[PDB]
Amino acid sequence: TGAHERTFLAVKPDGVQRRLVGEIVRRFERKGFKLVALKLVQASEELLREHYAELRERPFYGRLVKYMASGPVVAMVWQGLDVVRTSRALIGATNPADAPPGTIRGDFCIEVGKNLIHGSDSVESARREIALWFRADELLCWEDSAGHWLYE
Amino acid sequence: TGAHERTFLAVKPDGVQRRLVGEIVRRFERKGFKLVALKLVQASEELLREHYAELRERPFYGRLVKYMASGPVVAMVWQGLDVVRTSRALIGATNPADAPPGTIRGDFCIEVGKNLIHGSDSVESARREIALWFRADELLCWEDSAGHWLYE
Amino acid sequence: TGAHERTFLAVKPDGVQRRLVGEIVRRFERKGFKLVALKLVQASEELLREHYAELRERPFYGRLVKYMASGPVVAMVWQGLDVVRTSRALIGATNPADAPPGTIRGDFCIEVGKNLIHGSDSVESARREIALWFRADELLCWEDSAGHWLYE
Amino acid sequence: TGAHERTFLAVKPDGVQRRLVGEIVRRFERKGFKLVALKLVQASEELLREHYAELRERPFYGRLVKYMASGPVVAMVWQGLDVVRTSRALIGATNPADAPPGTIRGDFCIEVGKNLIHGSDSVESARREIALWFRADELLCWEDSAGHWLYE
Amino acid sequence: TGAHERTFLAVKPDGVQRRLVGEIVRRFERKGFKLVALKLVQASEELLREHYAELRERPFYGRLVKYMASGPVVAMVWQGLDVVRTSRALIGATNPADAPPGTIRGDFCIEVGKNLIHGSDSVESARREIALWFRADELLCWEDSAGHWLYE
Amino acid sequence: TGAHERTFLAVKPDGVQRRLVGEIVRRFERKGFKLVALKLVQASEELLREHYAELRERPFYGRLVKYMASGPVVAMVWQGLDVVRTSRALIGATNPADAPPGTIRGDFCIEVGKNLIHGSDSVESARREIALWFRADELLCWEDSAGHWLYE
């Protein structure tokens, strides 16, 4: 949907525990993306098994699920042009060792299991993840007055 | 409840529009309070009339309600010692003209109608506001590992 | 003029030298005031003797003038409600020893001679200072799109 | 001129509108470059047609000129070693989608039409741009006391 | 000694644990004070009983000593005009509930037992504390090039 | 030693002079590494000749040694997984002209002689540098409570 593209972001429990929710939000705000959904939730194992369904035969899958249910996450939807790809970029490589400073993981994380945040890896994944984590009435349209200064 | 005291905060639509959600969250995080609930909602006029029920005979009540329903707000619950009173302090006086720099309003706001954020003004108000805006299953207990360094 | 009130600010040479121009500007921006004039100039002794004409029989007047002409200053005009009084507040007491942290002087300055910035001390002073330092065609009207979120 | 090299920077109207002037200035300050000229101006279409003369057969040229005249810009000259090339780097790729986080565009911009700032693309361009936008008596020499700690 | 006045600061173990050492240092740097001594130490109970000798009949004394020996502290000496009194101010009231936002405790602390930092409360205390915690050859004179812009 | 790896960092005198000690510390803190040693020292020429022993036939060696002894440095040891390599990365290329924004040198430095900080370039170098600059009883173990949220 061009500038109506959406991605799903989740601050993982390490993010909440280390108090970096604000910091992360702020990076998306100042980049100019539009916050259209935000919930602090304790994810169920049922949901997380579906979230991570593509990773079900990998050896990390049990621990990854038990982890993401271990604490509160902050679930989020961000809207704007190319937001999925750009989010991946702001966040940085999956392994923080490969995430250059300036990215969230580059700045704040050391190890791949405690890398602070999930972002949808494709427009497809975002559609699925958004529907899985959020009811349609939790996604907000609002008239974004900043948008005259972010888009032509 | 001592260190289990809770207060309700809401970023008003100006806060969302001006992109200060992250900024505000970050101030509460770094102060050490524990985020126990968070959503982005479009508040109904029905809810807001109950929220602002103590102010129903003042002349600004209608416009205040029509305002807070004008856009998305970010509703929030924060937990910690004396959190209600301390929140009021971080936020600053209701009229920003009286809010000393260092406070959120002192730093970011000019006029009382566009003062960015609501905080519960008493323990009583917080009880009511929390119940009004949030179901009990939206408030999260999580084992706060920072708390050994915030409380004796 | 209400929300059209204007004040004159000058980053003094210490501010420029210590690299705090951006920092200071940013505080005014984020407070919500509207930047309507800005130049980097070397003030002449003639101008500064008139600028500081109220202080001409104090013993320190010579040194204050020779100082402010010692380097580049950043001259500025800021517009908004109560901007003169609020600027005085953001800046802090004239002697930084009396300027509480959170204010510019409270955060960045130690001694009264090197207190980083001048702000008009009254609406009267601002009228005079603005005319003294700036031609009318250097003050800009621009359609401030943030203003819907700072004023009612 | 080595460490006397100069580049022309302009905060575009989006930068002013979004209140990022201070932020941008501050990045140049803290990098260690020396601010030698600064004004807030409303650029004329005549000037901007000459400024963007190299881009006169591109399809974006009309809209780019009408844009940059649409609002106030902050025009700037920065001095230091390799300042032109390094400015290009701090700013980031022309298309923000290609600008890595840590750069100004990477951090703050989404689309190429609203990319916040112009920087001279060569020493040649800077010479021309500086003369076009600034009288010689607007460029200041000042004894930079930080410079002992930026240059060997 | 005027502008040669010195105070002793210690980031307490909560400050180290919560990762606020840099943050605290930065506040003193940007205020303009001169760092003349710095080490990370594990304080002995013997030292701490002497450090807190003024507080020996209060009921909190045992726990305060066992606490400050519980972890690493960052010991510091800062030099400049009125630095003792001004430090007390930047830090904020002993009980953070009384520390206004903008101060370190106001911004970062909730409870008096975990208030992040100690600062000498008098010139006398600073003399004693500096000698107790630091050898004379750990205090550095260095030619402070910023000082021409902090003092007249 | 895995997550017990250590690196030696030194803020060079330019760092101290330009007041960026806090800033630098803060970057390491927020990345999650563990500060295990810290002092402000005036390095002797004898020590620095040993520190820079690998560079003894290069033409810059005399000036490099006379420089690093010219003022106070802040010596530091940081512990965590891959801390040596990651420190190199946070710091940026040796020549700041090649250091992308987001890195310390990319953000703060212009020229190679005044590039603010040294970091060990290998685990080997760190072992040597740590022993050269620090007694064993200056390196602290402390029970890092943040570590559950940085490592699995």
Author numbering:
A (entry chain A), B (entry chain D), C (entry chain F), D (entry chain C), E (entry chain E), F (entry chain B): 18 to 169
Question: What do the authors report?
Answer:
With regard to their common enzymatic activity, NDPKs are NTP/NDP transphosphorylases encoded by the nme genes. They catalyze the transfer of the γ-phosphate group from an NTP to an NDP via the formation of a high-energy intermediate on a catalytic histidine residue. We produced a truncated version of human NDPK isoform C (residues Thr18–Glu169, NDPK-C hereafter) and determined the 3D structure via X-ray crystallography in the absence and presence of various nucleotides. A data analysis revealed a hexameric arrangement, which is organized as three dimers, as previously reported for other functional eukaryotic NDPK variants.
Since this was not successful, we depleted the nucleotide from NDPK-C×UDP crystals by back soaking. The resolution of the corresponding structure was reduced to 2.64 Å, consistent with the idea that the nucleotide stabilizes the protein. Interestingly, we observed that the area where the phosphate groups in the nucleotide complex are located was occupied by a phosphate ion from the crystallization liquid and even formed a hydrogen bond to the imidazole ring of the catalytic histidine (His135). The residues involved in the interaction with phosphate are distinct for each subunit, but mostly Lys29 and Tyr69 play a role in stabilizing the phosphate. Moreover, the phosphate interacts via water molecules with Arg105 and Gly136 of all subunits inside the NDPK-C hexamer. In the absence of a nucleotide, the α2 helix and the Kpn-loop no longer tightly close off the active site of NDPK-C. The distance between Cα-Phe77 (one side of the gate) and Cα-Val129 (the opposite side of the gate) is changed from 10.2 Å in the complex with the nucleotide to 11.3 Å in the absence of UDP at the binding site. The removal of the UDP was accompanied by a small but detectable conformational change in the protein, particularly in the helices’ αA (from residue Ala60 to Arg73) and α2 (from residue Pro75 to Ser87) region. The B-factor values in this region are markedly higher upon nucleotide depletion, reflecting an increase in flexibility. Taken together, these data suggest that free phosphate in the active site of human NDPK-C likely mimics the phosphate in the transition state between the catalytic histidine and the γ-phosphate in the nucleoside triphosphate. Nevertheless, the electron densities of the residues that form a linker between the αA and α2 helices have disappeared in one trimer of apo NDPK-C. These data indicate that conformational changes in NDPK-C upon NDP removal can occur, with the helix α2 displaying the highest considerable shift in comparison with the nucleotide complexed protein.
